[PDB]
Design a protein around this nucleic acid. Structure first.
Ligand SMILES: [Zn+2]
Ligand SMILES: [Zn+2]
Lengths: 156, 98, 44, 85
RNA sequence: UCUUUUAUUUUUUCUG
């Protein structure tokens, strides 16, 4: 009994055995009286990632599996005789927000700015010349249209 | 497209069955008067890439040693017809039954 | 005016669902001109 | 859907802020919606610790044809005490 | 009548 199990990439047991066996008819047609000592090759759907080849000598199997891509010939194990009948058993299984506005009596006079948030009685505006937010009452500030021009107090 | 024979287990294209039938079981099939389509099935598992009938001990188990080198499935689902089961008493079910 | 070109420096005034290709040239960086908004900045 | 805290009034109809307008803190500069099978905005707000003026904006198409945008923001840094020289 | 986001890791850069 010389049945050796070999690792290979899972999901392609069908295709790897196909390539091996087609190669084997090609070889057996090619050679003359002497023809290579491989007895059987097979696999199982339940046991993926592996094939099982029955052959007499390691160099015969290596010589046979040269030229076959993806087969991991470097991992082979000689399956013990006792494990074979079980392996081969036939039966397995607001409007002020966001608007442009100017200040008119404060240290920041003439500063344009944009209304961001209002907390009641006081509005926060970001200076259009400096990087700062300042809080100041709305009734004392003048609101304009989107575009520069006519100016109106807090009465919109 | 692939179909598996239910008696000897030879697996191959339905086309090649339609041309050449079953090379191993041609005589029995003709004697029983049953076409290869009924005695083959499409459902099979456990392939065998089969080379040495007279020397493969796997083949000695699977009852393929008297057949040609080829393409054999360890399981082929289905029940073989009585008109060949009676005429091949040495056969056993290939699905693991019996 | 909405958008302008890079090389030709020509206006396009395009809208959405339109290719960003310029008409005068195939060059299509497609800069966007300054906003119409009046801008205040103080020397501070 | 989930919009950012940035103010969306500054953004134009195309969804892109034009140069010459301030963007400060978390103010949005690019208006993005990412539909999948409701608008589900995915915009890129401005940095909280950064303030300045949108200097330039460029719209192009990548190799895949998808729209690409690059927005340059300019600010002035005057020396302060903590500045290193 | 409030709530309300800012991926992760691999690298590199420098700062004391
Ligand atoms: Zn048969
Ligand atoms: Zn142009």
């Amino acid at each position: 009994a010389t049945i050796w199990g070999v690792r290979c990439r899972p999901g392609k047991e069908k295709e790897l055995i196909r390539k091996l066996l087609k190669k084997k008819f090609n070889l057996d047609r090619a050679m003359g009286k002497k023809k290579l000592k491989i007895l059987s090759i097979f696999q199982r759907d339940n046991y993926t990632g592996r094939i099982y080849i029955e052959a007499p000598k390691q160099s015969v199997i290596e010589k046979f599996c040269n030229g076959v891509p993806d087969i991991y010939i470097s991992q082979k194990l000689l399956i013990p005789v006792q494990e074979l009948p079980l392996l081969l058993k036939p039966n397995l299984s607001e409007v002020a927000l966001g608007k442009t506005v100017r200040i008119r009596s404060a240290g920041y006079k003439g500063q344009l700015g944009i209304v961001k948030d209002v907390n009641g009685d006081k509005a926060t505006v970001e200076l259009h010349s400096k990087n700062k937010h300042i809080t100041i009452d709305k009734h004392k500030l003048t609101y304009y249209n989107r575009e520069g021009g006519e100016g109106i107090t807090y009465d919109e | 497209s692939e179909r598996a024979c239910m008696l000897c287990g030879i697996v191959q294209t339905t086309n090649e069955f339609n041309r050449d039938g079953c090379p191993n079981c041609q005589g029995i099939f003709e004697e029983a008067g049953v076409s290869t389509m009924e005695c083959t099935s499409p459902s099979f598992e456990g392939l065998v890439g089969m080379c040495k009938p007279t020397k493969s001990w796997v083949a000695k188990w699977l009852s393929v040693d008297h057949s040609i080198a080829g393409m054999y499935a360890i399981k082929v689902d289905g029940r073989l017809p009585a008109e060949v089961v009676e005429l091949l008493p040495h056969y056993k079910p290939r699905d693991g039954s019996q | 005016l909405k958008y302008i070109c890079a090389e030709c420096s020509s206006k396009l005034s395009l809208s959405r669902t339109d290719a960003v290709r310029c008409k005068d040239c195939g060059h299509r960086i497609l800069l966007k001109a300054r906003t119409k908004r009046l801008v205040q900045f103080e020397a501070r | 859907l989930r919009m950012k805290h940035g103010t969306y009034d500054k953004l134009d109809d195309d969804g892109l802020i034009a140069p010459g307008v301030r963007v400060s803190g978390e103010d949005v500069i690019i208006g993005k919606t990412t539909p999948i099978s409701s608008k589900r905005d995915a915009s890129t707000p401005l940095r909280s610790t950064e303030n300045g003026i949108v200097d330039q904006v460029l719209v192009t198409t990548n190799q895949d044809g998808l729209k690409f945008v690059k927005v340059r923001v300019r600010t002035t840094k005057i020396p302060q005490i903590g500045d290193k020289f």
